[PDB]
């Protein structure tokens, strides 16, 4: 009976909660208390990247740590030479409501998507001099909110149809559809080894998925409301989530629980972007109150602030060699920090 | 000071900036609008008329170009999204106006429309965004009230103690009952509007039938007023 199934679900959920309660023998604070506080970090706007007409929702660093793709709601992707602030490419988009972008690890492609429900893929390195649309991937019902290239032929898209998908770029069709969320999936972070990935939705729950077997492997809870950003710790055995309940939270896949929560009483805006440094000792979060906060992830004190934008910080990305951090906001500007 | 190839790269960037300026004039001269409504709301007929008179399977957003008096307008309605709305609505915090279409002749889904309007008005990102609400399907409301079968007092009890405002302007010559009813619906929406505006955004009411050909002119007039208010605030005149 339906009552029987519901009772079984409650029983298994209680069993999971009990196992999680048993496994938590010490807080990360209790063990992280020994260590010295990172100290205040002062990061300064080394470069300011002007040229976007409207607000920015997305940015992705290149694996060469110098090029930079940025997505604005005016209908542009701009590829910056971050060292010299030159504009390398200016890619006009077919749908202006872009709200994600990715930069292929090889550097031959970038992706973008938004309210059009499409993940368009752009070919940067053509024999002709221009940047052309390589493929348009269709099949999601809700909007696209994040995309991440696994290699030059496989991309993973999260959507607001409660579904993340894995695509074959050569043969447009989907290869795996990841179902199990009950709200809009907002962010997405591929693991370093690219065999797994996590996605946070609008149901306050995040899930570690399996790219090859196609099935959700874990589910994590603890947030009070919908999750806006997610990112892997450089280890690959953890991830941090920022949500509209004004908190960041650090889950761990092996313990399958929550480790620490990054919150302050005076901060009531929702986190919009989360990214780590190389060591993982600094958790950088972009908030709605126009400032990105820097959190010492091991002990959850506010390490620093990066307050320079004139409107909310929508995107935030740390480069692969850890040299710089870039922040894009709704004031049409990108800021590179050291 | 820097090499030949770097000079040529800087020249390329300067030409890109020149193109971005040329795109900025056309971006700043076109006005973006968001069209919202329900299934019964006649927003599809409105968009069809605005498309025809003036100027792809799971696509998540549609676009309509029209221009009135040489001023260009963009109108977007969502096509394939889910019922949840709190996240994709944030993308429209800088549109000129939100065109909110509501069916006035239902009486059963009208409280749902009022709730949707109150959510839109009070949204933390849709503040400073004025709403041009089209109280649609006026003739259905008229024939419904004359027929007398369905009682508006049972869904809305305060209508019994409601009297037509003195500012009312029933133009064609209409039964006072329908004028009273339609101004009651308008006053519900306008109490929601004036509860918490704070003078930063306005609500422009319009009694509309989807057949009407003057919707684009209404949008143009209201957008002119909105931009005028913004220019007042920006040019220090208040």
């Amino acid at each position, epitope marked *: 009976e339906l009552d029987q199934l519901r009772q079984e679900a409650e029983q298994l959920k209680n069993q999971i909660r009990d196992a999680r309660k048993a496994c938590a023998d010490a807080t990360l604070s209790q063990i992280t208390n020994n260590i010295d506080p990172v100290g205040r970090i002062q990061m300064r706007t080394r470069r300011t990247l002007r040229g976007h007409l409207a607000k920015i929702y997305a940015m992705h660093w290149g694996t060469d740590s110098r*090029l930079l793709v940025s997505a604005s709601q005016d209908g542009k992707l701009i590829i910056w030479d971050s060292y010299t602030t030159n504009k*390398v490419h200016a890619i006009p988009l077919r749908s202006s409501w872009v709200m994600t972008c990715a930069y292929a690890p090889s550097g031959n492609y970038v992706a973008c998507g938004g309210l059009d429900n499409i993940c368009s893929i752009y070919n940067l390195k053509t*024999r*002709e001099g221009n940047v052309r649309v390589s493929r348009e991937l269709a099949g999601h019902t809700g909007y696209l909110s994040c995309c991440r290239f696994l290699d030059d032929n496989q991309i993973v898209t999260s959507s607001g149809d409660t579904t993340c998908a894995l695509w074959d770029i050569e043969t447009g069709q989907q290869t795996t559809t990841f179902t199990g969320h009950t709200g809009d999936v907002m962010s997405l972070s591929l693991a370093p080894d690219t065999r797994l990935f996590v996605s946070g939705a609008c149901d306050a729950s995040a899930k570690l998925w399996d790219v090859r077997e196609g099935m959700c492997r874990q589910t994590f809870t603890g947030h009070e409301s919908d999750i806006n950003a997610i990112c892997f710790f450089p280890n690959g055995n953890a991830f941090a989530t920022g949500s509209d309940d004004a908190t960041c939270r650090l889950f761990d896949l092996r313990a399958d629980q929550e480790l620490m929560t990054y919150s302050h009483d005076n901060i009531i805006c929702g986190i919009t972007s989360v990214s780590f440094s190389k060591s993982g000792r600094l958790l950088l979060a972009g908030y709605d109150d126009f400032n990105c906060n820097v959190w010492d992830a091991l002990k959850a004190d506010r390490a620093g602030v990066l307050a320079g934008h004139d409107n909310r910080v929508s995107c935030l990305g740390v480069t692969d060699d850890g040299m710089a951090v870039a922040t894009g906001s709704w004031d049409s500007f990108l800021k590179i920090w050291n | 000071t820097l090499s*030949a*190839e*770097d000079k040529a*790269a800087v*020249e*390329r960037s300067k030409m890109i900036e020149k193109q971005l300026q040329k795109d900025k004039q056309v971006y700043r001269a076109t006005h973006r609008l968001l069209l919202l409504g329900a299934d019964n709301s006649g927003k599809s007929t409105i968009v069809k008329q605005m498309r025809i008179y003036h100027v792809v399977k799971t696509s998540g957003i549609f676009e309509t170009k029209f221009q009135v008096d040489k001023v260009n307008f963009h109108m977007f309605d969502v096509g394939a999204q889910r019922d949840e709305r709190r996240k994709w609505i944030q993308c429209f915090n800088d549109v000129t106006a939100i065109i909110f279409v509501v069916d006035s002749s239902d009486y059963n889904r009208l409280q749902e429309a009022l709730n949707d309007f109150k959510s839109i008005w009070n949204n933390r990102w849709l503040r400073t965004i004025s709403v041009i609400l089209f109280l649609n399907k006026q003739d259905l409301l008229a024939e419904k009230v004359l027929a007398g079968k369905s009682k508006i007092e049972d869904y809305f009890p305060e209508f019994a103690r409601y009297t037509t405002p003195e500012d009312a302007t029933p133009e064609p010559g209409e039964d006072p009952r329908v004028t009273r009813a339609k101004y009651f619906i308008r006053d519900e929406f306008l109490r929601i509007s004036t509860a918490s505006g704070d003078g930063r955004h306005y609500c422009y009411p319009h009694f509309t039938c989807s057949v009407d050909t003057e919707n684009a002119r209404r949008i143009f007039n209201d957008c002119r007023d909105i931009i005028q208010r913004m220019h007042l605030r920006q040019y220090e005149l208040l």
Partner: single-chain antibody
Amino acid sequence: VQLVESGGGLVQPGGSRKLSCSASGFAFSSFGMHWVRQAPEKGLEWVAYISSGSGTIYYADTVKGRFTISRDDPKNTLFLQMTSLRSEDTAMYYCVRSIYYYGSSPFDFWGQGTTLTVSASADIVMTQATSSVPGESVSISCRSSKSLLHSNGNTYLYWFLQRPGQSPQLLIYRMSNLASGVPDRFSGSGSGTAFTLTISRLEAEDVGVYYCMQHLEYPLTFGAGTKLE
């Protein structure tokens, strides 16, 4: 991509000619294009340069007022105007395509060339001392006067291969980067003044003349050429 060029022939001295370069198959307006010439049996020589947007124009010290370079983007052609032709202007003129941004490969395409016949300083000099040399390994060398390594970290040295019957093709740009389509056999290296190109295993299609080029500062000087037989 293809660059077909025309407008050359027998010319009486003191006359004038206008060369053209009709381009098809690429975004012409975003490429800065050069004219390069070579005397009937000698090495290549740079002539002029016009930039994207037509805002930067350079000329050789030997054509500084005699010549005039101009482009027509909507008509998608490249022109070179020549006045007061002398007997040192007998050469085949090449149309070269070059785009400049981070990571780009300038000089990556060369046109087939046009022949022009005329009847009867403080710039970097690069010398290829060797002038001649299947399945073996060859190590064509090169040398320069001023160091080519810039403060950017780039070493603006280019390698071109001219097969016995057609136009040069780019093999290596900025001393280390193999161009698109060149096999993995070719590789380049250097230090700032002395450079080398390595072919790991020859083939019957690797025979020709190897030319070097510097892009550090205009004019672009080339080098005599190394022959493989």
